[PDB]
Each structure stands twice: as structure tokens, then as C-alpha cells.
Amino acid sequence: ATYLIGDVHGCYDELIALLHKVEFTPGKDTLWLTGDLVARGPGSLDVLRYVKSLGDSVRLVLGNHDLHLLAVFAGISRNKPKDRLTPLLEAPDADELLNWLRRQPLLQIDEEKKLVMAHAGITPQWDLQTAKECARDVEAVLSSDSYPFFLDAMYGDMPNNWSPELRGLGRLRFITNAFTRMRFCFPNGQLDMYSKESPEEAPAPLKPWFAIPGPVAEEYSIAFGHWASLEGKGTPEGIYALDTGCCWGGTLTCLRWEDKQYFVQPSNR
Ligand SMILES: [Mn+2]
């Protein structure tokens, strides 16, 4: 079976309880994770150890808090006490875990399920070929010996409009924002980097990225996490918002793909 779980944010106990609820069995089952494995919750270290140990039985995409963790590790960004990352950063296997983490994809595609996963979703300005190429570009930087320079460059809110002509820092920044920070779009598909509220609270003419017809969503289902204020609700058919805010006192959600059956684990808070 195929299980998809939204943002774990260090909530190791809830993740394991949820996986036991579905009797997740590596070798028979596969787990897809929407990213943001770390931060806020208390067990980021255990979450990373376990997910890394699953190997081919897990298909991960990186989220914005995973990238932030990498930036702290590399000395690019300051540690916030609120993220609770110190046990992981000071762990004897920190190097092993974070060098594994930075080699994971931004995008997962399963053609037999016609299923696409990214942390924030797929901007309607991208077709599948473009999304694949952009994911590959950023993954090549993250997997290289010079990933700290990229992590330093990624911070920023511009440009917010895709063009195949984009080059250099702006091209990487747009790619990173689209995969890991996107929520609202302007009618032309351009990204808004400021509003984090539910679609109902957003000012016109802002709409959820998934409310704008895009070539990928027309042919593929899209699973994503990241947008906790969505509360997993209000999406069109074929769009699966899996982040139900576990670290925030909400729930951790698991979707079994074969029967679209939901399983939910209450936050331990
Ligand atoms: Mn998150």
C-alpha cells in the first residue's frame, strides 16, 4: 500500500502512532512525506533518523523548514530556539543525517499513479517538464559541495513570475519559493509571498495556487503539505492538502492512495 503523510515537524510520537494505526510495513508499503520533517515539534532528530532508515520505502520532498535546518547547519542562518533544532544539530550523527537530507528531491512523480508531490504544490505557471527541470536544477545545487552558497542565496521574495529566460540567482530563488513557500497566486499565476491565511481570508484577486488551472493539475493528482491554515480543506478534486497542523496542536493526516482512505492522529499537545 501507499501512504502519504503531511508535515511532521518533529512530531515523532504521532508519526509512529499513525504508521502503527495503518500497520505500515516497509517492503510491502511505501510512504510519501510532504517535507517539513523537522522543527517546532520536539523530535526532529528521531524523525530524521527514522525517515533516513526507511530507504526506498520512503519518497520525500524537502520543505522550507528542512532547507532552513540545512542553512543553520551550514552556518548560513541563525538558530531560533523556537524550532527546537539543537538536539539534532548537536547529535553525533548530525553530519550523516543532514548530508542525506540535502540530497533528497524537491519533487516526486509516480506516472503509474498519475501522482505528483511537492512541499507547497505546483505553480500553475509550470508544465511537468519545466517542474522536473527546475527541481533538478535546485537538487543539483543542494547535493553539491557548494550548497551553503545556494542556501545563502535562496532567501528572498523576488522574482515572483516564472519565465524560461530567468537566469542565475533569481531563477533559483523563484524555483525554491514555488516548491517550498507558495500559497496564493495572482490571476496570472504570479506568486504572493506575504499572505499565509486561509483562502476565505485572503484579499482579492488572490486565489490559492490550485484554484488556477495549470497544465500539471489537469493531468495529475497533486499532494502537498506546507499550508497549515488550509486545514486540509477546500481543495478541488485531484488536489490533496495533507498538512493539518500537527505541531500546532491539530492533527497528523495519512492518506492511503489505493482507496483514498484517511487516517488521523491527534496532536499529543
Ligand atoms: Mn510546515
Ligand SMILES: [Mn+2]
Ligand atoms: Mn512549509
